[PDB]
Paper text:
In such microorganisms, the majority of small molecules are taken up by members of the OprD outer membrane protein family. Here we show that OprD channels require a carboxyl group in the substrate for efficient transport, and based on this we have renamed the family Occ, for outer membrane carboxylate channels. As expected from pairwise sequence identities that range from 35%–50%, the Occ proteins share a similar architecture, with a slightly off-center constriction formed by the inward-folded extracellular loops L3 and L7 and residues in the barrel wall. The transport data demonstrate that Occ channels have a pronounced preference for substrates with a carboxyl group, due to the universal presence of a basic ladder on one side of the barrel wall.
To determine if the phylogenetic subdivision of Occ proteins exists at the structural level, we determined X-ray crystal structures for seven Occ family members (OccD2, OccD3, and OccK2–K6). A comparison of the crystal structures suggests that the division into the OccD and OccK subfamilies occurs on a structural level as well; the OccD subfamily members of which structures were determined have much smaller pores than those of the OccK subfamily. The pores of the proteins within the OccK subfamily show a considerable variation in size and shape, suggesting differences in substrate preferences within subfamilies as well. For OccK channels, conductance values are on average somewhat larger than those of OccD subfamily members, ranging from ∼50 pS for OccK4 to ∼300 pS for OccK1, OccK5, and OccK7. These data are consistent with the fairly large pores observed in the six crystal structures of members of this subfamily. OccK channels, on the other hand, appear to be less selective and facilitate passage of a wider variety of substances, with a preference for cyclic compounds.
Numbering used by the authors: -1 to 67, 87 to 394
Write the structure that this text describes.
Amino acid sequence: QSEFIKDSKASIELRNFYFNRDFRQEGASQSKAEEWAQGFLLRYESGYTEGTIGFGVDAIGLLGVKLDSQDDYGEAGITAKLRASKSTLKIGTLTPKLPVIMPNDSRLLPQTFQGGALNSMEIDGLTLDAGRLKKVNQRDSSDNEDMTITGGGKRQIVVRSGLTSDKFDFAGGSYKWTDNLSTSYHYGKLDNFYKQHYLGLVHTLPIADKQSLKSDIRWARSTDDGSSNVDNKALNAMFTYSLGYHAFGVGYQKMSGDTGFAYINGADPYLVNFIQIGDFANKDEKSWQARYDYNFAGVGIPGLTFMTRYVKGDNIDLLTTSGEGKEWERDMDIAYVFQSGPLKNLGVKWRNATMRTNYTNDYDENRLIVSYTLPLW
């Protein structure tokens, strides 16, 4: 009980989420949206009881309330935790972080899942996972529901009418060959929707200090599971050369097969050119990204960061008409974290995006996220 209490943590987060969206047609505004919401996030994580098999429990209290634009939404979640040696089993509310499932947390409240998961690190450098998710609790929702696949746009994903799934199975692993090179292999199956094999290779190469080249290479094969037409290969890689407080990144992404990339509806796709508005994951879509980061600590104003990126996509199959679909997006992020004063740790982040296409709706979008986390101890 010494670790249980001592490793235990609790916190309350205040979270303010604002966004506006302007649909552009010609050089004019066709329509606008605005959402404003306040969040209260209560988190608790126990440590583990002593012994061969340790037990712990996590609890989550998420409350969202629309400020303007059911008014109240959110969820309460409990998770039982078991740990033997270096293997941990979790049952209940899960938020896995894997190439085959990246839960959304870009709005007010996180997307969460119900199920059971196993993470294992018994062997030096080897990390294994496996699990089953049964239900998803979307970010704007109040309870748990069957999962579906991300559809729409020109993804050209087609599914049996009314189809839903209460089984997403996953298993995988990753191995650190050196402290600079790891590879990963991950499997995910959304029952009746798709099967997916994800391969990864991450290489960080220090030229000197402080200079580094990170190579992030990825490849996923997705295939149908009886009741969809899913058929996709996704090659996507990012190269990020870091020097001092600058980082310059280049990304490449290519869809092929009869549909775009397959991923749980509501989640984020693990793709290098997935950005603020577009995922550039339509049928046949190829896209290139250029990204620049600067961290103002490099001078005066620690806690202030800048980021901008540009992504250009083409070769999109328009599906019902001939011709090449093209789209492009530019993002600009500015983020500040108070380093001192009574406001310390208060976080504020502005995310700005422009999306333009030659075939569908264009819009601009601004997000302001204000965040403050207070430990209860």
